[PDB]
Design a binder for this molecule. Structure first.
Ligand code: E8M
Ligand code: ZN
Ligand code: ZN
Length: 201
């Protein structure tokens, strides 16, 4: 679910950043690890912010919907890191939003690949499952990626332990594809980010 908006692509892949106060060193290390993970696999780079108008701020506060997708023009955009959303996988996901990805399960073609069970979503979190209108996404020829760090698990924001919010429609290698199990960028994430940022080979 790569943004179709050219103005939301960080120019030259440069993403200036500030880390707010109140984080432990341990938490700051996670941010660096997640940023490095993106840097190592794509041409995106994270720079300590000096005087740039647009930049990201890792902000110590309760977890909550909803993060800005891509570069917000003209002022900073906060990433909410709280006690329950400060692990590597979640930060890598949130940085995916920053670089310009919506959730994979909200791709315009998503009903070909999964079913959303809206009844099972926690009230106030349905924003995270709402299908993107087709003009808002340009997938760059890449197919629906069940392995994406931007794809939720079967029960992400579910109302109960044994209830699914997302159910894949079909089998891949004999089973329904595992979703939302990985905590690292997928092959598909990397390929697509490389096209989005026009990275050299
Ligand atoms: C308390 N809190 C942990 C609940 C929660 N459930 O989802 C989320 C965020 C995305 C989870 C990314 C995860 C990465 C690994 C693969 C599966 C998906 C909310 C969100 O979309 N933030 O941008 N918070
Ligand atoms: Zn998200
Ligand atoms: Zn994708």
């Amino acid at each position: 679910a790569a943004t179709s908006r050219p103005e939301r692509v960080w120019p030259d892949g440069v993403i200036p950043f500030v880390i707010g106060g109140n984080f432990t060193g341990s938490q700051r290390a996670v941010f660096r690890q997640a940023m490095r993970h993106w840097e190592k696999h794509t041409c995106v780079t994270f720079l300590e912010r000096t005087d740039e108008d647009s930049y990201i701020v890792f902000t110590y506060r309760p977890c909550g919907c909803c993060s800005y997708v891509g570069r917000r023009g003209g002022g900073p955009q906060a990433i909410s890191i709280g006690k329950n959303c400060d692990k590597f996988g979640i930060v890598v996901h949130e940085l995916g939003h920053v670089v310009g990805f919506w959730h994979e399960h909200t791709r315009p073609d998503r009903d070909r690949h999964v079913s959303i069970v809206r009844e099972n979503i926690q009230p106030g979190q349905e924003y995270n499952f709402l299908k993107m209108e087709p003009q808002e996404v340009e997938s760059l020829g890449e197919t629906y990626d069940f392995d994406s760090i931007m794809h939720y698990a079967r029960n992400t924001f579910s109302r109960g332990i044994f209830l699914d919010t997302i159910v894949p429609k079909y089998e891949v290698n004999g089973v329904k594809p595992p979703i939302g199990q990985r905590t690292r960028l997928s092959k598909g994430d990397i390929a697509q980010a490389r096209k989005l940022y026009k990275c050299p080979a």
